[PDB]
A paper describes a structure:
JAK2 activity is crucial for hematopoietic signaling particularly in homomeric myeloid, and hormone receptors and activating mutations of JAK2 have been identified in multiple malignancies, most notably Philadelphia chromosome-negative myeloproliferative neoplasms (MPNs), where mutated JAK2 drives the disease manifestations. MPNs are clonal neoplastic diseases initiated in the bone marrow from a mutated hematopoietic stem cell. All of these compounds are type-I inhibitors that target the conserved active conformation of the adenosine 5′-triphosphate (ATP)-binding pocket of the kinase domain and show variable target selectivity and differences in clinical profiles.
Particularly, itacitinib demonstrated a more potent inhibition of JAK1 over JAK2. Other inhibitors do not extend to the tip of the G-loop. In addition, itacitinib makes a water-mediated hydrogen bond to Asn981. At the hinge, itacitinib forms hydrogen bonds to backbone carbonyl of Glu930 and backbone amide of Leu932. The highly favorable binding entropy of itacitinib is likely linked to the displacement of three ordered water molecules (visible in the momelotinib crystal structure) from the hydrated cavity near the tip of the G-loop. A more sparsely populated second water cluster was located at the tip of the G-loop and is exclusive to itacitinib. In the JAK2–itacitinib complex, which has a similar G-loop conformation, the G-loop is not stabilized with similar stacking interactions.
Numbering used by the authors: 840 to 1132
The structure:
């Protein structure tokens, strides 16, 4: 519906997050021009191309197909530039990315909250798996915080739909790749699956429990292990060699052994032995529930 969010009633409020190929802004949709309206988040491309706008169309269809408490809410599209461009309209979640929230609001985060966020992320990912969607970019930078009690997967720009007959998607046009969240078979064979999302979730869980101490981020920790001197493809070569022979991110300071064990099971080089997101949500909620109270 091109009349749902008309570009002339979509008012700027704040820049929220930008990268090489996309940007998100806070806007107010005020159809009555009475200084009221709901606040929304607006994603738009950067350095657009025909190929990227086609992908963005796929991204929009993917998000529109998703309705879940732990998936950011799709609201519509703005066909801006006189209906010669595309912008994606989403609900606005006010505490930003989980990566920033962990750093900025340590005062209101304890292990209980971390497990609750863990559970919620797994449940959102269970849901994606029922659509045969592979996220491919799971990281705390792409999780959003609605409030102290709820997080949602917040971006789907790299998400792919599995082929009808395969359980993996083989990417044949790799661009910007978050290699320090990648499963080994994604690095070596460009294969992405629910199981490689589980690998990446293992890194998310690590992130949560490092509390995003800059020296403990996965890129920083892997580069320390690889050698900070290394540059270029040599980094990838050493990362692959490291992972294939059981090199792993360390247990974070203060992390319970049981949570670290979940991490290490997600980081299984044997794809089929990785737990499912349903296993993980149940396991985490049972940890939470087995506590006193
Ligand atoms: N989550 C999360 C983190 C982000 N963010 C989301 C809010 C927010 N805040 C409050 N409420 C909200 N409601 C809905 C969103 C939202 C703030 N920051 C940063 N991310 C954007 C810029 C950087 N990005 C690329 O450069 C990029 C790289 C490769 N491919 C693509 C493409 F186009 F194909 F998709 C790209 F866009 C990725 C997209 C989303």
């Amino acid at each position: 519906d091109p009349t749902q969010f008309e570009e002339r009633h979509l008012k700027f409020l704040q820049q929220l997050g930008k990268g090489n190929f996309g940007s998100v802004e806070m806007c107010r949709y005020d159809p009555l021009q009475d200084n009221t309206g709901e606040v929304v988040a607006v994603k738009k491309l950067q350095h657009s191309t025909e190929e990227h706008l086609r992908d963005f169309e796929r991204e929009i269809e993917i998000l529109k197909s998703l309705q879940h408490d732990n998936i950011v809410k799709y609201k519509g599209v703005c066909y801006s530039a006189g209906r010669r461009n595309l912008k994606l309209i989403m609900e606005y979640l006010p505490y930003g990315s989980l990566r920033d929230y962990l750093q900025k609001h340590k005062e209101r985060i304890d292990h209980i909250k971390l497990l609750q966020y863990t559970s919620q992320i797994c449940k959102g990912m269970e849901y994606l798996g029922t659509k045969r969607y592979i996220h491919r970019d799971l990281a705390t930078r792409n999780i959003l915080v609605e409030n102290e009690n709820r997080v949602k997967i917040g971006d789907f720009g790299l998400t792919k739909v599995l082929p009808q007959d395969k359980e993996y998607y083989k990417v044949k046009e790799p661009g910007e790749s978050p290699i320090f969240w990648y499963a080994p078979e994604s690095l070596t064979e460009s294969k992405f699956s629910v199981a490689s999302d589980v690998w990446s979730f293992g890194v998310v869980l690590y992130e949560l429990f490092t509390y995003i101490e800059k020296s403990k981020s996965p890129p920083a920790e892997f580069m320390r292990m690889i050698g900070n001197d290394k540059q270029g493809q040599m980094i990838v070569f050493h990362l692959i060699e490291l992972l294939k022979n059981n090199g792993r991110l360390p247990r974070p300071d203060g992390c319970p052994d049981e949570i670290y064990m979940i991490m290490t099971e997600c980081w299984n080089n044997n794809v089929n032995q990785r737990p499912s997101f349903r296993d993980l949500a149940l396991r985490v909620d049972q940890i939470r529930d087995n506590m006193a109270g």
